[PDB]
Amino acid sequence: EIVLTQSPGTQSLSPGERATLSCRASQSVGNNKLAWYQQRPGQAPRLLIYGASSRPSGVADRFSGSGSGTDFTLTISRLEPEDFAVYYCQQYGQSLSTFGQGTKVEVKRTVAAPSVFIFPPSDEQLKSGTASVVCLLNNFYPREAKVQWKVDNALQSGNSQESVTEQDSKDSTYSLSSTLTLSKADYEKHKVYACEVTHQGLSSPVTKSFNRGE
Partner 1 sequence: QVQLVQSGAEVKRPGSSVTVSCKASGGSFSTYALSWVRQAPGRGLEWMGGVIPLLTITNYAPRFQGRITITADRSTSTAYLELNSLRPEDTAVYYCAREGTTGWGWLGKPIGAFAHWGQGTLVTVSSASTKGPSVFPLAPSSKSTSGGTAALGCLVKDYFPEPVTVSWNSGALTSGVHTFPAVLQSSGLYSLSSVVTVPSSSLGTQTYICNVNHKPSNTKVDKKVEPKSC
Interacting residues toward partner 1 by CB under 8 A = 1, 33, 35, 37, 39, 44-47, 50-51, 54, 56, 88, 90, 92, 95-102, 115, 117-122, 124-125, 128, 132, 134, 136, 138, 161-165, 175, 177, 179, 181, 214
CB of 188 to partner 1, least distance (A): 17
Residue among 10 and 117 whose Cβ is closer to partner 1: 117
CB of 171 to partner 1, least distance (A): 11
CB of 145 to partner 1, least distance (A): 14
Query: Which residues does 164 contact at the CB level (< 8 Å), separation at least 6?
Result: 143, 174, 175, 176, 177
Residue among 177 and 200 whose Cβ is closer to partner 1: 177
Residue among 90 and 142 whose Cβ is closer to partner 1: 90
CB of 47 to partner 1, least distance (A): 5
Q: How far apart are CA 71 and CA 93, in angstroms?
A: 15
Cα-based distances in Å from 70 to 17, 22, 67, 76, 88: 26, 10, 8, 20, 15
The strand order across the sheet containing 160-164 reads: 115-119, 130-140, 174-183, 160-164
Amino acid at 58: G
Quick one: 128 exposed, middle or buried, by C-beta within 10 A (0-12, 13-18, 19+)?
Answer: exposed
Residue among 52 and 107 whose Cβ is closer to partner 1: 52
CB atoms within 10 A of CB 170: 6
Q: Give me the phi and psi of 87, to 5 degrees please.
A: -125, 130
Residue among 14 and 159 whose Cβ is closer to partner 1: 159
CB of 9 to partner 1, least distance (A): 11
CB of 163 to partner 1, least distance (A): 5
Residue among 49 and 151 whose Cβ is closer to partner 1: 49
Q: How far apart are CA 135 and CA 15, in angstroms?
A: 32
